[PDB]
């Protein structure tokens, strides 16, 4: 009747009492003895120009040299970041892109947006042009993120409150993730490719299982829409980013929030979140046109990147940790080191 | 430096020529964002200009137009309305016959709730709005058998067509809290009109002149 509703409330009371039973000492209490990071001063090494509209997403390659970038001009440009050379310029069938992914093998790129379609492109054709491999159609909402598992498996997020794992060769979604209440905005695959997290507009990030299709955990710390999410390099933690002017780190094993990265001078939303290779520096894009780096164990601002004239929309650190790419709405894609 | 590297720069220098060439073809196209609360006459307008976003390309007097219909996909508007920041004008259609109809929870009241969320938006502080007040040929059904007091209890006025339709137009223009930066162009439509693409042409020409004058400092 309604006794199923009240049972859900004491079930939330059991979870909250289980989180408080493990909360003995904060992460700020343990790391008082460790050394503070010095003021990190990354300079702009390469500015990648050639886009004519707002850059909405980038993704690094696993070779840590090639990066793809998506912009509203209808162009998906693959850059050689060492020499500022444009390797490919892929015209898109709809210019309303909001995400882009680079395959771990380097053979494929994906994109998607307001067309509700994730289009996989083939870079390694015997012809010299980039062709459309597949078009993943059935997702009934604006496609917010896409991430490659393998060459044949890609997981997507959309604004239809669902995530979907796709089989590329068959063109059909094999597993649909329907736990969210609001529009899912960001993805982050785990390093072992078995789990992934997804933040949505109901201020909740959920830990998903790829093989089973079940929601393993749910984290409810934020105050508004989670725009960015990123796994720790360990795979046991992830940080979020919201319009609360707050990034916060969650733990998959303690099943609660560990630390809050917030400053009173910041009153703007976080658009992009990435970690360093060690996880010591948590980098966060902001609507204050800057990218603030955060010492992820002490919650203090280790530095700032201030070379952008508009909103830092996307952010990515290489696999070897050498560079940080910052794309923004001023049509520029800056490489920091 | 190397032979292969020099040919890679020559490939990249042939790409940014194509990006610069395709960027000029996109700047000639006038972008228009077509909105409207439900089926308020969006389908009649796109026939007059002749699963996600739906784009419609049409030309009128040597001017290329791009019209985006984003009502086909329902989600939170706050997360993708910043994609249309550089649009030339917003085409907001309101069915004038929707003053008596109520939805499941008033249908003209939801058009006024959609209008002030778009007109007073932070991404549309300077974008002109071409307000199409559709379905004026439902004069013959609605305003004689049912007065305008159903949705506007503040109004007594007159039950004639001309002064009741001017009241609905004024109630949509009073929601504009930015009177010095943007302009609301209002046209009435009966779904048997051939002059609807002309009113869009006269509106954008004013916006193109106003955008050119703000670049030169005259505004």
């Amino acid at each position: 009747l309604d006794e199923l509703r009240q049972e859900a409330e004491q079930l939330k009371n059991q979870i909250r009492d289980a989180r408080k039973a493990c909360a003995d000492a904060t992460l700020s209490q343990i790391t008082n003895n460790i050394d503070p990071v010095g003021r990190i001063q990354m300079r702009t090494r390469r500015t990648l120009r050639g886009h004519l509209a707002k850059i909405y997403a980038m993704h690094w390659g696993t070779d840590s040299r090639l990066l793809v970038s998506a912009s509203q001009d209808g162009k998906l440009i693959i850059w050689d970041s060492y020499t500022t050379n444009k390797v490919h310029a892929i015209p898109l069938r709809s210019s309303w892109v909001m995400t882009c992914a680079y395959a771990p093998s380097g053979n494929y790129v994906a994109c998607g947006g307001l067309d509700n379609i994730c289009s996989i492109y083939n870079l390694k054709t015997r012809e010299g042009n980039v062709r459309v491999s597949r078009e993943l159609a059935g997702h009934t909402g604006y496609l917010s993120c896409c991430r490659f598992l393998d060459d044949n498996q890609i997981v997507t997020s959309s604004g239809d409150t669902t995530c979907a794992l796709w089989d590329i060769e068959t063109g059909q979604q094999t597993t649909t993730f329907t736990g969210h209440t609001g529009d899912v905005m960001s993805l982050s695959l785990a390093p072992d490719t078995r789990l992934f997290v997804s933040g949505a507009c109901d201020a909740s990030a959920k830990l998903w299982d790829v093989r089973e299709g079940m929601c393993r955990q749910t984290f409810t710390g934020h105050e508004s829409d989670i725009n960015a999410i990123c796994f720790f390099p360990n795979g046991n933690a992830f940080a979020t980013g919201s319009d609360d002017a707050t990034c916060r780190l969650f733990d998959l094993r303690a099943d609660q929030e560990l630390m809050t990265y917030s400053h009173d001078n910041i009153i703007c939303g976080i658009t992009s979140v990435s970690f360093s290779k060690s996880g010591r520096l948590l980098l966060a894009g902001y609507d204050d046109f800057n990218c603030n780096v955060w010492d992820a164990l002490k919650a203090d601002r280790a530095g700032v990147l201030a070379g952008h004239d508009n909103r830092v929309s996307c952010l990515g650190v290489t696999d070897d940790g050498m560079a940080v790419a910052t794309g923004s709405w001023d049509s520029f894609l800056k490489i920091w080191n | 430096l190397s032979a292969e590297d020099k040919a890679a720069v020559e490939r990249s220098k042939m790409i940014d020529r194509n990006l610069r060439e395709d960027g000029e073809k996109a700047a000639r196209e006038v972008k228009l964002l077509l909105l409207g609360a439900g089926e308020s006459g969006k389908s009649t307008i796109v026939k007059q200009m002749k699963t996600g976003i739906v784009e419609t390309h049409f030309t009128f007097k040597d001017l290329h137009f791009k019209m985006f219909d984003v009502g086909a996909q329902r989600s939170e508007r706050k997360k993708w309305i910043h994609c249309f920041e550089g649009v030339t004008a917003i085409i907001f259609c309101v069915a004038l016959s929707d003053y008596d109809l109520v939805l499941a929870e008033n249908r003209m009241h939801e058009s006024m709730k959609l209008f002030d969320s778009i007109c007073n938006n932070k991404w549309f502080t300077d974008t002109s709005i071409i307000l199409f007040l559709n379905k004026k040929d439902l004069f013959e059904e609605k305003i004689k058998k049912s007065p305008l007091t159903i949705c506007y209890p503040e109004y007594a006025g007159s039950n004639t067509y001309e002064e009741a339709a001017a009241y609905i137009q004024c109630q949509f223009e009073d929601l504009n809290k930015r009177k010095d930066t943007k302009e609301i162009y209002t046209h009435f439509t009966c779904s048997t009109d051939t002059k609807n693409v002309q009113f869009v042409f006269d509106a954008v020409t004013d916006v193109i002149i106003k955008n050119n004058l703000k670049d030169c400092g005259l505004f």
Partner: single-chain antibody
Framework: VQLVESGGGLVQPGGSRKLSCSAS????????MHWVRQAPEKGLEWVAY????????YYADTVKGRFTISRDDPKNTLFLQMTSLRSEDTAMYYC??????????????WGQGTTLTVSSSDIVMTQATSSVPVTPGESVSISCRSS???????????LYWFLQRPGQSPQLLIY???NLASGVPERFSGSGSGTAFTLTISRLEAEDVGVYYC?????????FGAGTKLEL
């Protein structure tokens, strides 16, 4: 992807001819194109090169002034205007495509070639052993040596291996000294230091016989080796 050339024949010396190379099945405008000749019972040598969009055009010192390369991208045809043909111009002229970006595989597809009969400094690549007796089943190693160090400052070593089966066009085996091309098996492996290189085949088959050609791409003119023949 196919390149079929036309325009060969028997030309009197001092005459002129226009070889045409019609491209089909790939993006011709994105590919830079070469002409590589092959004299009868001799090795390959490069003639000319035209880039994408005709912005960079290079010639060999033997054919400079006399020969003229050109391309027509709406027609997918490639031309080589030959003027004042000498007695040393009798060769089979190949049409080679090559795209140039990061991680690309240039010299990947060769045309079938046309026979021209005329009726009468530079990095020297010394492929030392001309003939190797081998039988199928065991490994073989083809050595190549260069007059200059091909290891550039960007970390790339520009050595390109080719295999010409008897009666067939050459095909790419290994590009940039360690990367096997698309379509070749894992038997072929390449290693080198900058001036001395080797191409090792793991288990030799009857498909793998032919003449193996060494090539450099560090600077123009691109020079070939004399050829190492494998017999069985």
């Amino acid at each position: 992807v196919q390149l079929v050339e036309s325009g060969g024949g028997l030309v009197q010396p001092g005459g002129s001819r226009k070889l045409s190379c019609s491209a089909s099945g790939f993006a011709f405008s994105s590919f830079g194109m070469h002409w590589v000749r092959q004299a009868p019972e001799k090795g390959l040598e490069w003639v000319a090169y035209i880039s994408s969009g005709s912005g960079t055009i290079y010639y060999a010192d033997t054919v400079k002034g006399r020969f003229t390369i050109s391309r027509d991208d709406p027609k997918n045809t490639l031309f080589l205007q030959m003027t004042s043909l000498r007695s040393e111009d009798t060769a089979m002229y190949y049409c080679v495509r090559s795209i140039y970006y990061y991680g690309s595989s240039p010299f990947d597809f060769w045309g079938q070639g046309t026979t021209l009969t005329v009726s009468s400094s530079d990095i020297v690549m010394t492929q030392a052993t001309s003939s190797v007796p081998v039988t199928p089943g065991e490994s073989v190693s083809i050595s190549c040596r260069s007059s200059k160090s091909l290891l550039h400052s960007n970390g790339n070593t520009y050595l390109y291996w080719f295999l010409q089966r008897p009666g067939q066009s050459p095909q790419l085996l290994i590009y940039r000294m360690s990367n096997l091309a698309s379509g070749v098996p894992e038997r072929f492996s390449g290693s080198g230091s900058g001036t001395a290189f080797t191409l090792t085949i793991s288990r030799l088959e009857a498909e793998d016989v032919g003449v193996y050609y060494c090539m450099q791409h560090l600077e123009y003119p691109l020079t070939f080796g004399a050829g190492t023949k494998l017999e069985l």
